[PDB]
Amino acid sequence: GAMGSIFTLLVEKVWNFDDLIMAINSKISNTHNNNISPITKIKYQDEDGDFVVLGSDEDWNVAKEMLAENNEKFLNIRLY
Structure with missing residues (x-):
């Protein structure tokens, strides 16, 4: 992915970080044709105008509280 895409x-x-990975995994590799390549480690747009490195359920429960800290529910993703 040298182009750079997002997933809001x-x-x-x-x-949970598990259920989260499912959504992404469904938008990155859900079709069964021949061979697929899923993912796990991804980035997200933090409340600092810059993507960061999410750990797991931890940074997921934290990033979540940050979204509802106002009125946001959508989460951005990156493909490094």
């Missing part, structure tokens, strides 16, 4: 979806206040 709608997450809930219950979605």
Whole structure:
């Protein structure tokens, strides 16, 4: 991915890092044709105008509280 793409979806206040990876995995590799290549480690647009490195359920529960800290529910993603 030398072009650079984003993934802004709608997450809930219950979605775990697992459920999160499912959404992405469904938008990155959900079709069964021949061979697929899923992912796990991804980046997200933090509240500082710059993508950061998300750990797991930890940075997920934190990043979540940051979204609802105002009125945001969508989460951005990167493909490094």
